[PDB]
Amino acid sequence: MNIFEMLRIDEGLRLKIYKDTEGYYTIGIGHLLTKSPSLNAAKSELDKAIGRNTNGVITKDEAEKLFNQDVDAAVRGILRNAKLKPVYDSLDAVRRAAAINMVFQMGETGVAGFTNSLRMLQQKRWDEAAVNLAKSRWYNQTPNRAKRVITTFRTGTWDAYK
Ligand SMILES: C1=Cc2ccccc2C1
Ligand SMILES: [Cl-]
Ligand SMILES: [Cl-]
Structure with a gap:
């Protein structure tokens, strides 16, 4: 077991924009896109993160890339x-x-x-x-x-x- 596997189990994996447990637009492995209620705002955040016109959908690879960035960011945040x-x-x-x-x-x-x-x-x-x-x-x-x-x-x- 490890952090990545542990979070993958807790967060799951979805390739299309969805709403988290708090109702916020998320995608991938728990990557919060926005708190705002606008799906469009969420789709724009999405494209900005991925670097392409995604249309609200990403690949597995893309999901995993976001996950890595988010894992790193978190550790780095704790450390600061x-x-x-x-x-x-x-x-x-x-x-x-x-x-x-x-x-x-x-x-x-x-x-x-x-x-x-x-x-x-x-x-x-x-x-x-x-x-x-x-x-x-x-x-x-x-x-x-x-x-x-x-x-x-x-x-x-x-x-x-x-
Ligand atoms: C909950 C406990 C704890 C300890 C160190 C860093 C961050 C956290 C979050
Ligand atoms: Cl739960
Ligand atoms: Cl990002």
């Missing part, structure tokens, strides 16, 4: 984040994957109100953090996915994904 970096650096390789999944899904900004969980994680208090992470909108909204990421932090193994 002063609030995040230190936590992330304290973690073992499996848990780091879990931390990227979260940022990938909700952004640096989404992962902001997680201060108390961050601190518990940094402290290596797994069970307590597991509990704290569950008390969140994220958990209530996407419970199955949240349980997986949580188990991953709790255990430090890929069990939830196997």
